Design a protein around this ligand. Structure first.
Ligand SMILES: CC(=O)N[C@@H]1[C@@H](O)[C@H](O)[C@@H](CO)O[C@H]1O
Ligand SMILES: CC(=O)N[C@@H]1[C@@H](O)[C@H](O)[C@@H](CO)O[C@H]1O
Ligand SMILES: CC(=O)N[C@@H]1[C@@H](O)[C@H](O)[C@@H](CO)O[C@H]1O
Lengths: 495, 484
């Protein structure tokens, strides 16, 4: 029933108890935001400014660094663009995923000229190979943004890259891309408000729908500016967008453009007395709690208030069964520009747009062999009407009166000799980490919030940008421009 | 540039300094919310549960009362109706207003059967009369709600009663009525969310426009549920409405109904960085500062956040020049329920809807003589498209860190050595009054126990402030510079 940490600690105390291994980062670098955890290779990769690191996730003081800056020529070109020589004209690594069984794929802002390449790690982890394959350099457009201020939700599977970010120099052509591989890169309609409206990506996950890979979907989480009318009402909408991994675009229309793209509002609010709810629209981070059933990973989300005078944070939970229901629900439909959004009620193209091409029903092989009505629809119906509410219609945690806001989250399923509890590790914009448990107080609905620890993990206060949980090292890794930080999950002999 | 009070005295500290005179109220009464300040008679009237008091503006310890509790039969028909005998089946007065030069008009919850009567107080404030003219008894349909939990905004001028409440037993028929005074009662359209949609009234004021009494309009202030498509997103819209004092409805169609009603949204928000503003739509009280020009009183308003989690209160100022600009602008317009609201680009009938009939300009000297096209319009065009923003597009004061919320307000115009300064005495839902000057002087508790301040009057001819609540009334001096 309290909101005070039963165990508070500062970077100081943490350092005087063996609970923090700080990497202060090189003097000629920053922005250690991109994390690529690798349990197998037992290393923790962190792509930053002009560099890419390979930390030893047992003690991040031991590592390797691939200095990957940009050519003098490129630097100058960025300079001539009237940009910030130090803050902007640098190669900020924004993408870092796995590719070959011996190479990583990395992308970054090549000083407002996105470039990517490979990072040979090798076959055997025994011989820690951290070699950068220079001279190649592939087009970074659509993979890493031009502006370092923008992030990227990346997902690299089966040799193909999925990434949502701003694709242009002007940084106003945001789109979900599918690069690499065999086929021509896939993209979302550009300059189309109904598809994407000045969004900001958070993450992308490969979620299987059944035992048939043919039915694999890729979910992107992101926030964007709402759209409804020409009335005084700007607003944010956290969202989740689904797309079929086996989508290859239209035939005589959406050429090389997703055909199975749909989105739904993710609502994270707290019911009120007079019937008006309090919403946490600003989606900051998302973590998937892998259930034994890969088809139903639990979705935790870290949301924030839109108001500048009412700072607040929330942690909402969603079940895929819900998102799937929404995605199988009414399509948001609007007749004219000055019409109220209404749930579409009348003839839906078959197969249902949004549904992946199946060699069992309809028989239609490949998206490229779909009717025209199933391409015209979806093309103007990217959004679902009904929103997906959190489990139980409320967040499992809320922090208001506090002076900081949540920025990252990860959770471990710890089995206790009296049941299992989902322990959340929430990162703050202040540089502190909170460990909380939401045990159901006597009954689901009236649950108790327990703040176990509040540990600062950076000499100076900074915004936490990345968190990676290791269930093989039992170590948490925080990231920021100030550098990376490592700490143990527990500390049971200090309570 | 601060948030801490220079003078934070508690009730104990206020009582131990003659800073507050307390009336713990009667045991058989409560809800002392209906205030009526009479300078001339130097008394302060008050409406309450089965009672109507009369406090002395010098010492509320000295007072007269009137017992008006509803008969047995009525108390019984209310019980069988399935109401709470203790907190419902009683006569809670909701309207106290001066009527004749010798009488006051009063109405209360007739134990869910509102009734009204007069209250004699003679010509001379010397004889201090307070006789409850019993017998007869008129009904209070449209004058007072049936439900004590509902407020009412009244204004009785020229022998006419203007009020906005629930005209029904079920408390669902909210309306703005004008009863009394020579003509058949006139009211807003029943069951039409466009006109009014589950509103909560706050107050009505007469404000002339021109130097012609015929252009006089009555303005109501209230808060109601916004309407914007079947699509969800419940929200509150603070509002202000106007009505011509001389509106008596049409010949046929809109018969005995406002043909001049128009209403506009009142915005009180704070600009944000990402273009998103923080709004305070829950109007709580209104005070008009009589400026030099009687056609331009400054409008102060106390708004609160709709959010149950984040508590926050704000005060906002509005000029009647702005309000009038909005009423002379585009009406809101819809082609149906599935359409977006849009400023009416069509051709507005003449005379312009919302325009008081006049024996001068206009050509018409009666609202009943208006043509069909205007009456038809209006009937479906009671709302305006442009909301009226507050002076500077910002609120004067803000409180969010605070763990309470404003509930009442009054302001005094005090002449000093530097110039005139407007001091705002803000009430609180936790028994407390904040004194504020602009460009927090003191935070004083005024009740032994915490409650909601629901009434607040200011007597300049006595330099005192009176606060209302269910606990009782509280007297307090505007300054007491000694404590400083
Ligand atoms: C050009 C560049 O930034 N890379 C240097 C790298 O060559 C050097 O070994 C290291 C030592 O701290 O410092 C980095 O900043
Ligand atoms: C070992 C292997 O088969 N993986 C390949 C690697 O051989 C190749 O050089 C690289 C592109 O440079 O792409 C990887 O996926
Ligand atoms: C409810 C009622 O009938 N009113 C009584 C009144 O007769 C009496 O004069 C007064 C003073 O004690 O107390 C009230 O409760």
């Amino acid at each position: 029933k309290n909101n005070v940490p039963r165990l508070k600690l500062s970077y100081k105390e943490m350092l005087e108890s063996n609970n923090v291994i700080t990497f202060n980062g090189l003097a000629n670098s920053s922005s250690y935001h991109t994390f690529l955890l690798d349990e197998e290779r037992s290393r923790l990769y962190v792509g930053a400014k002009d560099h890419i690191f390979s930390f030893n996730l047992v003690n991040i003081k031991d590592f390797q660094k691939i200095v990957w800056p940009v050519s003098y020529t490129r630097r100058d070109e960025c300079k001539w663009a009237g940009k910030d020589i130090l803050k902007e004209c640098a190669n900020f690594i924004k993408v870092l995923e796995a590719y070959n069984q011996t190479h990583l794929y990395a992308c970054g802002t090549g000083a407002f000229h996105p470039i990517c390449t490979y990072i040979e790690v090798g076959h055997h982890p025994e011989d820690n190979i951290f070699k950068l394959q220079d001279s190649h350099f592939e087009n970074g457009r659509g993979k890493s943004p031009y502006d370092p201020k923008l992030l990227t939700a990346s997902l690299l599977i089966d040799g193909e890259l999925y990434s949502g970010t701003a694709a242009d120099f002007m940084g106003r052509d945001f789109a979900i891309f599918r690069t690499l591989g065999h086929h021509h890169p896939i993209r979302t309609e550009q300059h189309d408000s109904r598809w994407l409206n000045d969004p900001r990506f958070i993450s992308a996950h490969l979620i299987p729908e059944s035992d048939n890979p043919e039915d694999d979907k890729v979910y992107f989480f992101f926030r964007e500016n709402a759209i409804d009318g020409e009335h005084s009402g700007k607003a944010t909408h956290a969202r989740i967008g689904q797309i079929c991994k086996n989508d290859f675009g239209g035939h005589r229309s959406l050429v090389n453009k997703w055909t199975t793209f749909l989105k739904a509002r993710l609502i994270c609010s707290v019911p009120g007395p007079n019937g008006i709810d309090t919403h946490f629209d600003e989606l900051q981070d998302v973590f998937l709690m892998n259930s034994k059933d890969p088809k139903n990973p639990i979705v935790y989300g870290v949301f924030t208030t839109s108001s500048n005078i009412f700072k607040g944070s929330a942690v909402c939970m969603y079940s895929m069964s819900d998102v799937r229901r929404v995605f199988l629900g009414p399509y948001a439909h609007r007749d004219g520009p000055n019409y109220q959004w209404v749930p579409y009620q009348g003839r839906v193209p078959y197969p249902r747009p949004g549904t992946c091409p199946s060699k069992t029903f309809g028989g239609f092989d490949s998206t490229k062999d779909l009717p025209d009505d199933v391409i015209t629809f979806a093309r103007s119906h990217p959004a679902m009407y009904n929103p997906v509410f959190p489990i139980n219609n409320r967040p499992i945690m809320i922090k208001t009166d506090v002076n900081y806001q949540f920025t990252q989250i990860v959770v471990d399923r710890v089995d206790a000799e009296d049941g299992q509890y989902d322990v959340m590790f929430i990162g703050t914009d202040v540089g502190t980490v909170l460990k909380v448990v939401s045990v159901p107080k006597e009954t689901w609905h009236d649950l108790e919030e327990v703040l176990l620890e509040e540990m600062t993990v950076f000499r100076e206060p900074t915004t936490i940008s990345a968190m990676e949980l290791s269930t093989k090292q039992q170590q948490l890794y925080i990231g920021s421009t100030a550098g990376v930080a490592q700490l143990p999950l527990h500390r049971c002999d200090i309570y």
